[PDB]
């Protein structure tokens, strides 16, 4: 009967557990939270370039090779795919590269080489810029001014004003990419008071922790502000299972920084006194050796670490007890009056408060038992606060009904604070006024051996007033000072899975506390604050990095792109969740909330820098013709300076345009075959890889028109290679153009834009930046903190905590 | 534990016996109530003390 039902639980608890993303070892979450870095301070050592000036041969009309050669602006690493859709998903991968290769601070002194052909000692900005200015100097074709000017391009160092500017040679696309990296830094100046303003306000205005700043920081020191703002994804309301990890992780992180107790009562002396007063051998009770199972000096530390960390992370807390063992239930009166009663999951809060009333409080005053239906908006203390007639007890039941977390907002965060009657411990003086008169009013039908075994069990806690008022001064001071090191909001919703607290472990805390006061030492109070900013700065640097891909996929009109892969990338970088157990419901709100957010300011202007230059990168490439124009008549080849004789079109004017990437997705080839079997002029825009024939005997034979007929045989449009005629002197058979009296005619030309020439005056521009920095990533390493002696430690009131000695 | 808004359960159809097996079925009602007598015998708790 036992192993059937202890296994029937672990099936139903495992269909629930396979929708929570918590890791299967519970304490393994703590290793993943310390292990995140602040960020990576990226500094580029080469100026960002996508264009390079290349040498190209130049033809005249009646095309021969001119002896002059002219520069052009052909781009390098042109890995541009074919098709109008794969040319757009290339620019998303370009945009993903530049967000990763984005320098946070640009120092410009280390990227500077000597101008080897200057008269004065002048510098430039790159090893590639000096290669260009070496090449414009030696060229015979260049103007006499540019041979004179690039000898006199002097840089201006100004060490006293900390500014420096160097000459440069950049493309106009490359210049806007390299003024945005250089004007919009992420470093901000750092003074000696912005370290003092970093520390939380409750700690530097506390008199225990003595914070003193020792190291001297110069004027040239900068730092990186953590992107530190509250969760613009409301992860608390609609996410039932994604929130149950972000309070599980903040629980085990806050479980390691709440300190452990020292100098307790000896557990062999307190048990022998407690076993004398209960008089357990004389009773006829089914639980004799089971009252005192959970009293140790280890369960006292386990109850202290739980009750603070389940309070700092707003994690619910189911109770576990046994209603026979009233000594785990009298001590449960202290738990409800100190821990705010909205913390517990409600059906156990009721089942602990009904079990106190129905066995201890209502048999005391002799009134009838408590028939309680569960679907009732009144808690069982809220019913007996109006029906009980004693005033010392009813004025205690007015406090357990009304201790909840009163939400206050300070220093930009929302933290759930306690009330000032419980934070100085005066509430326990009201409970012992209720617990004294509950140990005097005789239990009018209880057996006499069971009446004194439960009145002396009360006086094991009623007589322990001074050790227990001094406990809640400590339990609400460790919670009060650890809450200064909280950066995220403290939102209180009912979590799915509850961290079980045993009431046999609360009764090992109330009567095994000693008057040695613990306090979070400032080495583990700056560690809990640096591990809670670095998680909150990482959580914001991913919801800004995911939105700049969710939006940039939609501005680029990339269909065939699954946003579930980006949100699985987003929940994987955040080191708590795992992408398996999270349900498919709560990942379709997560891809829906992320579409509505605004993109971050420094990721938007560099995407608008690509979107307005999305054409001019893919236009000036080789290996891509961006449309073919078929006319089915004899029109001449337009003579060109760069290609010689060429069939090229400058604009699709007066022709019906068939969008080829639309023609690929739909498969609706009813028009294009009806435009080819009949001889009608069609233009086919897209992104078509051309081939380049040089012979003129391939032009008279007219192999330019024999390529478009493959669409009707096999319906795919990928294998389209419109040819591009290049009739030059260096091509073969060029006697057939020069000697004979004919004009070269091509039926179908192709659409292509020629690359722009190298103009020095529109390519030289100074780059003005700073000279030296010293980026400090750590900021609590400048304060030198030493705590006060622990025995002189004070609460919010300037009287000391643990005032029993 | 409290359960989310996306949990479900299959409700069993618990409606009283539409055959009236206690009526005129004097052989089938005997072994349908020995089945219920032996089950209730191994449930009712034994005395102590």
Query: Which residues in chain A are contacts of B7 at CB distance < 8 A?
Result: 16
Count other Cβ atoms within 10 Å, centred on residue A714. Answer: 9
Q: CA A764, CA A146: separation in Å to the nearest integer?
A: 11
Q: What ranges in A217-326 are assigned the alpha helix state H?
A: 243-246, 249-255, 267-278, 299-312
Contacts of B4 in chain A (CB under 8 A): 19, 240-241, 496
Compute φ and ψ for A436, nearest 5 degrees: -75, -50
Q: Do B3 and A16 touch (CB under 8 A)?
A: yes
Q: How far is B12 from chain A (nearest CA, A)?
A: 18
Terminal CA-CA length for chain A:
53
CA–chain centroid gap for A530, Å, is 16
Dihedral sign for Cα atoms in the order A418, A424, A428, A429:
negative
Buried b (16+ CB within 10 A) or exposed e, A279-291: ebeeeebeeeeeb
Q: How far is CA A729 from CA A60, A94, A129, A640, in A?
A: 11, 39, 34, 13
Give the Cα separation of A629 and A326 in Å (integer): 92
Dist. CA A586–CA A239, nearest whole Å: 6
Residue A326: which H helix or E strand, with range? none
Q: Please tell me what resolution, in angstroms, this structure has.
A: 3.6
Q: How far apart are CA A157 and CA A165, in angstroms?
A: 7
Task: Look at residues A643, A746, A638, A750 and name the one whose alpha carbon lies nearest to residue A686.
Answer: A750
Nearest to A112 by CA among A183, A185, A46: A46
Which tokens is A575 given?
């080191």
Task: Compute how many other C-beta atoms are within 10 angstroms of the C-beta atom of residue A555.
Answer: 12
Decide: A479 and A418 in contact? Cβ < 8 Å: yes
Q: A239: exposed, middle or buried (C-beta count within 10 Å: 0-12, 13-18, 19+)?
A: buried
Q: What share of chain B is helix, strand, coil (3-state, %, to 5)?
A: 30, 0, 70
Cβ(A533)–Cβ(A485) under 8 Å? no
Contacting A with CB below 8 Å, chain B residues are 1-7, 49
Residues A130, A135, A137, A142: is their CA dihedral positive or negative?
Answer: negative
Q: Which of A420, A430, A513 has its CA nearest to residue A464? A: A513
CB A69 within 8 A of CB A140: no
Residues of A in contact with B5 (CB under 8 A): 240
Q: Which residue has the tokens 């008279």?
A: A700
Element holding A592 (H helix, E strand): helix A590-596
Cβ pair B4:A498 closer than 8 A: no
Owner of token pair 């292509």: A752
Contact between A13 and B1 using a beta-carbon 8 Å cutoff = yes
Distance CA A483, CA A311 (A): 10
The dihedral region occupied by A193, where left means phi > 0, alpha psi between -120 and 50, and beta the remainder, is: alpha
Which residues have CB under 8 Å from A702's CB, separation 6+?
Answer: A747
Residues of B in contact with A347 (CB under 8 A): 2
The minimum CA-CA distance between B37 and chain A, rounded to whole Å, is 19
| Main-chain phi, psi angles of A84, to 5 degrees | -75, -15
Contacts of B10 in chain A (CB under 8 A): none
DSSP A593-641: HHHHSPPPHHHHTTTHHHHTTHHHHHHS-SS-B--EEEEEEEEEPEEET
d(CA A172, CA A792) in angstroms, rounded, equals: 67
Q: Give me the torsion for CA of A101, A107, A109, A114, rounded to 10°.
A: 20
Both structure tokens of A650: 């400058």
CA pair distance A501, A279, nearest whole angstrom: 27
Q: Which residue of A has its CA nearest to B2?
A: A496
Distance in angstroms (rounded) separating the CA atoms of residues A228 and A230: 7
Experimental method: cryo-EM
Tell me the DSSP string of A550-588: HHHHHHTT--S--THHHHHHHHHHSTT--TTTS-SSTTT
Asked if residues A52 and A527 have their Cβ atoms less than 8 Å apart, the reply is no
Distance CA A145, CA A760 (A): 11
């Amino acid at each position: 009967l036992k192993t059937k039902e202890e296994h029937q639980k672990e099936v139903q608890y495992e269909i629930l557990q396979k929708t929570i993303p918590t890791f299967e070892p519970k304490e393994s979450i703590l290793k993943k939270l310390e292990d995140i870095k602040p960020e990576q301070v990226k500094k580029q050592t080469k100026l960002f370039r996508i264009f390079e000036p290349r040498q190209l041969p130049v033809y005249r009309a009646n095309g021969e090779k001119e002896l002059r050669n002219r520069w052009y602006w052909k781009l390098k690493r042109d890995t541009l795919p074919d098709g109008d859709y794969d040319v757009r998903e290339y620019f998303l991968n370009l945009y993903d590269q530049v967000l990763t290769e984005m320098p946070d601070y640009l120092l410009l002194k280390d990227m500077a080489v000597e101008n080897k052909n200057s008269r004065d000692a002048g510098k430039v900005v790159d090893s590639e810029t000096a290669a260009i200015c070496d090449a414009i100097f030696q060229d015979e074709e260049t103007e006499g001014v540019v041979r004179r000017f690039i000898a006199e391009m002097r840089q201006r160092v100004q060490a006293d004003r900390n500014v420096v500017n160097y000459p440069s040679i950049l493309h106009p696309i490359d210049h806007a990419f390299n003024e945005y990296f250089l004007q919009h830094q992420l470093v901000e100046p750092l003074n000696n008071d912005i370290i003092f303003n970093y520390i939380p306000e409750r700690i530097r205005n506390d008199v225990n922790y003595i914070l003193n700043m020792d190291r001297n920081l110069p004027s040239t020191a900068r730092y990186i502000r953590p992107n530190l703002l509250q969760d613009r994804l409301n992860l608390h309301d609609n996410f039932e299972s994604l929130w149950d990890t972000i309070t599980t992780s903040n629980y085990i992180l806050a479980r390691s920084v709440v300190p452990d107790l020292k100098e307790l009562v000896s557990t062999e002396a307190q048990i022998q006194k407690m076993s004398q007063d209960l008089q357990l051998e004389a009773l006829t009770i089914q639980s004799e050796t089971q009252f005192l199972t959970g009293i140790n000096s280890q369960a006292a530390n386990d109850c202290f670490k739980t009750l603070i960390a389940a309070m700092l992370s707003q994690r619910t807390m189911s109770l576990d007890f046994v209603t026979t063992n009233y000594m785990s239930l009298i001590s449960g009166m202290w738990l409800l009056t100190v821990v705010p009663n909205d913390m517990f999951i409600r059906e156990s809060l009721v089942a602990c408060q009904l079990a106190i009333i129905n066995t201890i409080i209502y048999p005391a005053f002799g009134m009838q038992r408590m028939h309680y239906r569960n679907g009732d908006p009144q808690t069982p203390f809220q019913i007996a606060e109006q029906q009980i007639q004693n005033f010392q007890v009813a004025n205690w039941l007015h406090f357990v009904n009304n201790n909840q977390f009163r939400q206050v907002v300070i220093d930009g965060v929302l933290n759930q604070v306690l009330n000032d009657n419980i934070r100085n411990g005066h509430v326990v003086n009201q409970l012992m006024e209720a617990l004294m008169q509950l140990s005097r009013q005789q239990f009018p039908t209880m057996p006499v051996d069971y009446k004194r075994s439960i009145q002396r069990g009360i006086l094991l806690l009623s007589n322990r007033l001074g050790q227990l008022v001094d406990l809640t001064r400590l339990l609400a001071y460790n919670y009060e000072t650890l809450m200064a090191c909280i950066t995220m909001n403290m939102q209180h919703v009912q979590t799915l899975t509850t961290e079980k607290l045993q009431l046999t472990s609360v009764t090992s805390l109330c009567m095994l506390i000693g008057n040695a006061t613990v306090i979070p030492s400032p080495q583990t109070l700056f560690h809990y604050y640096n591990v809670n900013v670095n998680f909150h700065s990482n959580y914001n640097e991913r919801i800004n990095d995911a939105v700049a891909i969710i939006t940039a996929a939609n501005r680029l009109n990339l269909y065939q792109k699954k946003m579930k892969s980006i949100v699985e990338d987003f929940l994987k970088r955040l080191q708590i969740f795992d992408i398996s157990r999270v349900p498919d419901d709560q990942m379709y709100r997560l891809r829906d909330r992320l579409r509505l957010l605004p993109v971050e300011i420094r990721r938007l202007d560099i995407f608008n820098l690509i979107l307005m230059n999305m054409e001019q990168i893919e236009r000036a490439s080789d290996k891509i013709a961006q449309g073919v124009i078929i006319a089915y008549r004899d029109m001449q080849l337009e003579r060109d300076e760069m290609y010689g004789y060429v069939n090229i079109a400058r604009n699709l004017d007066g022709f019906q345009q068939i969008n080829l990437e639309e023609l690929m997705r739909t498969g609706d080839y009813a028009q294009i075959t009806n435009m080819l079997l009949n001889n009608q002029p069609v233009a086919l825009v897209g992104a078509l890889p051309f081939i380049t024939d040089s012979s003129v005997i391939s032009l008279v034979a007219k192999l330019d028109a024999t390529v478009f007929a493959q669409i009707v045989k096999l319906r795919k449009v990928d294998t389209l290679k419109p040819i591009l005629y290049k009739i030059n002197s260096d091509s073969n058979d060029f006697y057939l153009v020069a000697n004979y009296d004919w004009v070269p005619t091509s039926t179908t030309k192709v659409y292509k834009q020629i690359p722009q020439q190298f103009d020095f005056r529109a390519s030289m521009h100074m780059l003005t930046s700073n000279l030296t920095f010293t980026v400090y990533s750590d900021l609590l390493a400048f304060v030198s903190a030493d705590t006060v002696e622990p025995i002189n430690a004070v609460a919010f009131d300037n009287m000391r905590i643990m005032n029993e000695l």
